[PDB]
Amino acid sequence: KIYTKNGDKGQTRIIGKQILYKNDPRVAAYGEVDELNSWVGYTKSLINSHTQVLSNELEEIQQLLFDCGHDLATPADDERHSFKFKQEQPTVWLEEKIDNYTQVVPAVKKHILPGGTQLASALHVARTITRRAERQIVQLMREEQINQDVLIFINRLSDYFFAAARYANYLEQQPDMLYRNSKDVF
Amino acid sequence: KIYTKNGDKGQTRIIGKQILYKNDPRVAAYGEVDELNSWVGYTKSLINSHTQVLSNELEEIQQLLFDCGHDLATPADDERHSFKFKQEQPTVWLEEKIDNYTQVVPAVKKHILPGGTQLASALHVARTITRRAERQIVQLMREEQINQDVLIFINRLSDYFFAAARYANYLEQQPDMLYRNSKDVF
Amino acid sequence: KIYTKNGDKGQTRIIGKQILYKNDPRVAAYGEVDELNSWVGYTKSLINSHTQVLSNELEEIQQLLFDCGHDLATPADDERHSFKFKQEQPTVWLEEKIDNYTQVVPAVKKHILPGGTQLASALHVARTITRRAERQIVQLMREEQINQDVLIFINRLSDYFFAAARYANYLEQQPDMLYRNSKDVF
Ligand SMILES: Nc1ncnc2c1ncn2[C@@H]1O[C@H](COP(=O)(O)OP(=O)(O)OP(=O)(O)O)[C@@H](O)[C@H]1O
Ligand SMILES: Nc1ncnc2c1ncn2[C@@H]1O[C@H](COP(=O)(O)OP(=O)(O)OP(=O)(O)O)[C@@H](O)[C@H]1O
Ligand SMILES: Nc1ncnc2c1ncn2[C@@H]1O[C@H](COP(=O)(O)OP(=O)(O)OP(=O)(O)O)[C@@H](O)[C@H]1O
Ligand SMILES: [K+]
Ligand SMILES: [K+]
Ligand SMILES: [K+]
Ligand SMILES: [Mg+2]
Ligand SMILES: [Mg+2]
Numbered sequence: 001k002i003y004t005k006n007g008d009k010g011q012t013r014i015i016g017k018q019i020l021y022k023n024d025p026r027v028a029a030y031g032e033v034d035e036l037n038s039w040v041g042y043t044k045s046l047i048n049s050h051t052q053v054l055s056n057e058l059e060e061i062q063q064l065l066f067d068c069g070h071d072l073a074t075p076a077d078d079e080r081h082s083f084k085f086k087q088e089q090p091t092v093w094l095e096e097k098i099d100n101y102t103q104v105v106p107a108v109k110k111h112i113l114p115g116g117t118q119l120a121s122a123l124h125v126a127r128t129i130t131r132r133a134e135r136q137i138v139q140l141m142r143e144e145q146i147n148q149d150v151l152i153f154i155n156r157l158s159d160y161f162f163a164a165a166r167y168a169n170y171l172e173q174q175p176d177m178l179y180r181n182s183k184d185v186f
Numbered sequence: 187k188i189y190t191k192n193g194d195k196g197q198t199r200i201i202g203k204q205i206l207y208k209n210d211p212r213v214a215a216y217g218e219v220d221e222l223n224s225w226v227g228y229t230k231s232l233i234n235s236h237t238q239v240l241s242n243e244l245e246e247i248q249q250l251l252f253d254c255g256h257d258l259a260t261p262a263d264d265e266r267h268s269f270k271f272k273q274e275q276p277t278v279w280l281e282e283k284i285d286n287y288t289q290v291v292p293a294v295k296k297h298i299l300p301g302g303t304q305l306a307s308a309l310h311v312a313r314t315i316t317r318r319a320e321r322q323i324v325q326l327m328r329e330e331q332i333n334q335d336v337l338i339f340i341n342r343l344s345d346y347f348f349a350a351a352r353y354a355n356y357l358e359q360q361p362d363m364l365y366r367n368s369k370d371v372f
Numbered sequence: 373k374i375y376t377k378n379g380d381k382g383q384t385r386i387i388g389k390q391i392l393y394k395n396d397p398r399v400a401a402y403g404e405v406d407e408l409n410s411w412v413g414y415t416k417s418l419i420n421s422h423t424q425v426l427s428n429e430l431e432e433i434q435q436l437l438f439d440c441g442h443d444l445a446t447p448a449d450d451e452r453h454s455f456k457f458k459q460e461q462p463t464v465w466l467e468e469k470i471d472n473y474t475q476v477v478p479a480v481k482k483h484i485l486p487g488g489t490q491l492a493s494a495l496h497v498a499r500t501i502t503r504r505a506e507r508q509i510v511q512l513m514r515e516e517q518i519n520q521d522v523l524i525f526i527n528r529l530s531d532y533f534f535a536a537a538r539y540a541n542y543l544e545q546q547p548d549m550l551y552r553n554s555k556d557v558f
């Protein structure tokens with residue numbers, strides 16, 4: 001039975017079982033990561049024949065976001081519970097994709113309108129939810145020690161979603177629109 | 187004319203007409219409930235022939251979320267304005283659905299990736315927005331008396347969305363994926 | 373290379389290059405506007421033959437939201453960097469659309485369930501994200517001078533999304549549902 005009712009007065013438990021209010025910065029941080037993970041699942045459900053090449057990596061991101069959320073739910077001071085997420089191989093893996101997707105699509109110097117195909121648009125939504133989760137992770141960092149590797153990966157991840165969004169448009173022959181007042185920023 | 191312009195400097199009114207800033211915790215709480223309600227409307231628009239059995243209950247949730255938001259917009263101390271939402275029958279109704287949907291789908295012991303079909307994925311998005319609204323309701327509770335029945339229902343509602351999401355996948359013969367590092371948690 | 377890694381410890385730059393934490397109210401404000409802009413791109417991707425008349429204006433909103441975000445990223449005190457967004461013509465343009473869409477659809481006196489077609493439902497999601505961004509803009513205003521024209525436009529914009537959502541339902545012969553406990557509020 002998934003409903004325990006223990007949360008009905010607004011408190012809940014983190015890893016190690018201590019109790020926090022649900023609006024605690026820590027709970028908010030891994031809560032936003034869960035929201036992002038759910039949005040990535042929604043984004044993956046929009047994949048079509050033209051965009052199947054993106055499916056595996058989005059599922060892999062979902063697995064990695066669970067690892068990130070686990071670590072955000074882990075208090076530094078309880079030595080019974082270790083951080084598990086190590087940024088190097090995940091983050092390199094993102095960077096390789098950012099480099100290959102940047103190479104393939106038409107180069108721009110301006111910001112672009114976040115949109116195009118339904119999948120590209122969903123990848124821009126993922127980009128911005130990732131950045132919202134990142135803000136909450138930084139909130140938490142300013143009050144508690146965190147696994148800083150999670151922050152590295154989450155920062156890189158929104159660049160991945162930008163590059164993937166442009167690639168998704170490319171895969172369906174949809175051009176990106178430029179912001180009509182962009183200075184040359186890239 | 188829906189635009190009054192009275193909010194153009196960032197203030198607005200709650201039930202009873204007092205004026206608050208738009209970033210007041212109370213406004214944020216029922217604002218997040220409105221966002222959830224809109225997402226539930228979007229989720230319902232994704233229903234297909236295979237998933238029609240979910241339509242009625244999602245519309246009912248929308249009506250209940252208006253009742254919740256009304257109460258969150260109601261200050262305790264103004265006796266002219268009563269709380270209207272009573273948790274027992276709504277919450278029991280959710281629990282019956284959680285029990286029947288839990289029964290029908292394949293049992294898991296691990297966390298699952300939030301995704302699958304477009305509708306199941308949208309139900310996971312609903313789950314996480316509900317939880318975001320819940321955090322904001324708890325913020326407000328820690329500063330002002332609230333209708334605690336709203337919090338009970340909102341807590342239960344995210345368990346409903348989890349169970350419904352798994353059921354939606356079942357209705358389209360889509361299995362759930364396990365988190366590859368989940369301990370047995372359920 | 374879009375990834376600089378300068379943000380990997382949670383700090384970033386605004387217009388004029390000063391450094392802020394990513395959870396700074398200013399960063400959150402224009403971050404929520406970026407999220408809204410991405411959602412408007414997603415909403416536009418749902419346009420069908422029946423709803424093509426809405427495409428141009430949603431793209432125009434995306435361009436205007438970049439102008440708003442630019443100004444939110446601009447500190448008042450650095451005289452090298454000017455506000456660019458002027459509310460009058462954008463806001464009048466929204467109001468004309470609100471008036472024409474209000475005229476055409478069936479009049480209601482009660483709140484409606486936010487939903488209907490997939491596009492109308494997405495326009496209600498846009499409405500509520502706009503309002504979430506507005507709360508964060510008001511947060512920032514209460515700590516720093518801002519371009520108040522941005523707030524005018526963002527307030528009006530959520531009324532636009534409400535009116536457009538009802539119009540989208542009308543364009544596909546979908547009626548709006550009333551909240552079953554609404555007093556006559558409009
Ligand atoms: N609103 C929320 N936002 C983010 N994380 C939450 C929220 N509520 C609970 N959590 C976290 O997610 C885990 C799973 O949530 P769950 O809803 O099962 O917990 P609960 O609300 O404390 O209990 P219950 O829902 O059974 O009364 C909790 O153990 C806690 O770590
Ligand atoms: N940004 C917002 N987030 C959440 N709730 C809001 C927000 N702005 C207003 N509210 C609430 O929702 C109701 C309807 O919003 P509405 O936009 O009509 O109000 P307003 O902004 O004060 O007025 P106007 O938009 O006509 O200038 C308000 O009466 C207030 O209770
Ligand atoms: N999480 C965020 N939320 C909102 N705005 C952000 C966030 N991170 C950065 N910004 C803003 O958006 C701009 C573009 O973001 P970008 O991710 O390129 O910056 P960064 O994180 O500081 O650098 P990098 O990602 O290259 O390490 C930044 O210059 C800053 O103004
Ligand atoms: K639960
Ligand atoms: K209004
Ligand atoms: K970057
Ligand atoms: Mg530890
Ligand atoms: Mg970054």
Ligand SMILES: [Mg+2]
Binds near residue numbers: 266268
């Ligand atoms: Mg009262």
Ligand SMILES: [Mg+2]
Binds near residue numbers: 007341342344345
């Ligand atoms: Mg709960």
Ligand SMILES: [Mg+2]
Binds near residue numbers: 446449452
């Ligand atoms: Mg200036």
Ligand SMILES: [Mg+2]
Binds near residue numbers: 193527528530531
């Ligand atoms: Mg308003």
